Amino acid sequence: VQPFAAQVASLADRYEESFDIGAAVEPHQLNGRQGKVLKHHYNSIVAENAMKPISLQPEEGVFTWDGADAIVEFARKNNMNLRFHTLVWHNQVPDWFFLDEEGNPMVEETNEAKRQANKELLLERLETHIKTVVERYKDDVTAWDVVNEVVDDGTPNERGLRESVWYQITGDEYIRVAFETARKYAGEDAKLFINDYNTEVTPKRDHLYNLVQDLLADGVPIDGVGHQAHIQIDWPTIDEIRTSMEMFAGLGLDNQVTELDVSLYGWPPRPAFPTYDAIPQERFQAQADRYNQLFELYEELDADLSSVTFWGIADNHTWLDDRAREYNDGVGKDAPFVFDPNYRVKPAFWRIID
Ligand SMILES: [Mg+2]
Ligand code: NA
Numbered sequence: 001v002q003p004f005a006a007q008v009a010s011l012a013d014r015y016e017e018s019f020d021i022g023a024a025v026e027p028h029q030l031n032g033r034q035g036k037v038l039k040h041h042y043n044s045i046v047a048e049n050a051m052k053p054i055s056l057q058p059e060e061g062v063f064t065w066d067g068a069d070a071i072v073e074f075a076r077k078n079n080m081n082l083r084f085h086t087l088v089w090h091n092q093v094p095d096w097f098f099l100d101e102e103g104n105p106m107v108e109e110t111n112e113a114k115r116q117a118n119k120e121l122l123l124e125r126l127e128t129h130i131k132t133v134v135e136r137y138k139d140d141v142t143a144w145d146v147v148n149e150v151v152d153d154g155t156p157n158e159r160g161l162r163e164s165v166w167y168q169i170t171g172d173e174y175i176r177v178a179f180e181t182a183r184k185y186a187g188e189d190a191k192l193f194i195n196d197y198n199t200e201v202t203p204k205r206d207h208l209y210n211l212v213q214d215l216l217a218d219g220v221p222i223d224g225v226g227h228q229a230h231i232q233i234d235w236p237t238i239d240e241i242r243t244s245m246e247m248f249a250g251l252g253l254d255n256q257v258t259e260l261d262v263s264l265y266g267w268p269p270r271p272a273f274p275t276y277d278a279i280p281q282e283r284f285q286a287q288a289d290r291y292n293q294l295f296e297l298y299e300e301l302d303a304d305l306s307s308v309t310f311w312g313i314a315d316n317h318t319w320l321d322d323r324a325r326e327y328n329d330g331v332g333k334d335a336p337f338v339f340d341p342n343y344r345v346k347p348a349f350w351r352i353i354d
Contacts (some may be wrong), residue, residue, distance in 0.1 A: 002344045005037045005314075009353050011338075012043040015265035020044040020081055021307030024259065026317075027070040034313050034344050038074075044081035044142070046258070046309055047071050048319075051085055054299030057129055060096050065136070072140050083258065083309060084137060086145035087130050088178045088196060090164035097125055100166050101314040107168050118215055119170050126174060127181045130317035134185040143256060143307065145195040146176055146182045153198065156311025159214075174209075176220050183221035183248055195258055200236040200244045209247055216251060223255030230311070232263050233290045257298070259311040261336035262287055262322055262348075272324040272332030276315065276341055279333065288347035291338065295352040316341035320322045 011262045012021040022044030029035070038045070049055055050067030050249075069203045074094055086123070100106050106118040135145075152162045161167055164173045184193055192210060198204050213221055225248045227241075245255045264283045265272055296303055312318045315335045324332030338349040 002163065002340070002346065002349075004345045005339050005345060005349075006040050007347065008345055011041045011313055011353065014353055015299075016043075018299055019305050020307040021076060021310075022046060022081070022307060023313045024048040024051065024084065024085075024309065025071060025074075025309045027067045027311070029317070030070060030074045032293040037339060037343055038080075039078050039196065042080065042111065044083060044307055044309060045071065045075050046083040046085050047103040048085075048311070049083070049092070051133075052127065053087070053097075054091060054092045054094045056133055058216065059232070060125070063132065068137075070303055073226075074139060076140065077144060080200070081142040081307070083142050083256075083307070084133075084145060085258075086148040087133065087182060088126070088146065088166070088174065089148040089152075090162065090166060096168065107165060115169075119173070122166075122169050123173060123177050126177055130178060130181040131185050134182055134190075138186045138190065141186070141190070143191045143224075144182055144186065144227075145191055145258070146192050146222075148180050148195045149197065150175055151196050151204055151211060154203055155203060155207070158213065165327060176215065176218070179215070179220050179222055183314070191223045191254070192221055193224045193226040193254075193258075194222055197228040197230050197259075198236075199225065199227045200231075200240040205244055205247070209251075212253065213250070222253065224256060224306075226256050226258040228259040228311075229257045230259060230261055230263070232266060233286050235266075236348060238293055241294075242301065245282070245301055245304060249301075254304045255301070256309070257305070258306040258307075258309050260308060261311045261318060261320055261334075262290055262294075263334050263336055265324065265334065268327040269324045269332070270327045270335065272334065273330045274328075274331050276333050276335065279335055283335070284347045287335075288351045291348040292351040310337055312337060314339035314341060314343050315346075 015021050020043050023042050024049050098106050146319050152160045156163050173207050320334035324334050338346050340346050
């Protein structure tokens, strides 16, 4: 039996010369055993869900602040940094954004002049959402995910930009307006990030590189790249990870790891073990070696890496379980973190605290 998390060395303190150590949280986790683990080990937090656009402005002019406020309060009380996830995304985003003045979807519009008016209305709505949110949280947030997942996994257009509703209505303009709006209301010292998954592999990596180069050339304020790092044991390679961070550091950008989890599976995650108990020791060992190499790379790169956030605290709460159940008939368990479902350490803990 492994010791409890509160009996081992703080991860945040272990990494205090290199980068923050963060966790994605929900408001209900900010007391009890999670509360304790958080305070002991972490010096940054992010909202898993409560600061996404639909969580903050579910109807126009109607702001729901309480979950988000509770997260901010917890960070302040415990002297934690706070990442804002996220100003702009194509999911968990309210439908009302994308409806024209008569209530019909803007994407359906064929008259070029009405389309231009729709583009301007959506951009103005985006600006209002950003202005309102940034005004409330500008003195708490230490890193903004200003846009999330705006780059495509393939190449549907020459710039590799995701053809979401934002793109269909505004082209790339939503991205420019989101950064400029955030800079304007948060101030010059605010740290603005473009966040995405699979930043280590091509062609996405290069499309993202080209996008940030382009926007920097136009004076669009971007401070860094957020690497979600939803990764596996063998993929991507350490070198793929390294190369991606070095490329962005080459443009004068900061890197953060924002949503780290190390799945026990491939993609899709099948076959998956049905219970935590069913997972063999070998999975935890191979994960531990993987985590060792990750954190050695993060330390080597620490001039260009300011924060490493995990997408959860302990293995009792992870969205990888939703994915395992989805691809295995509603039955499956992943185990991505250094802390097990009882808040005891896992073999990976030892390999990143040393
Ligand atoms: Mg180590
Ligand atoms: Na650093």
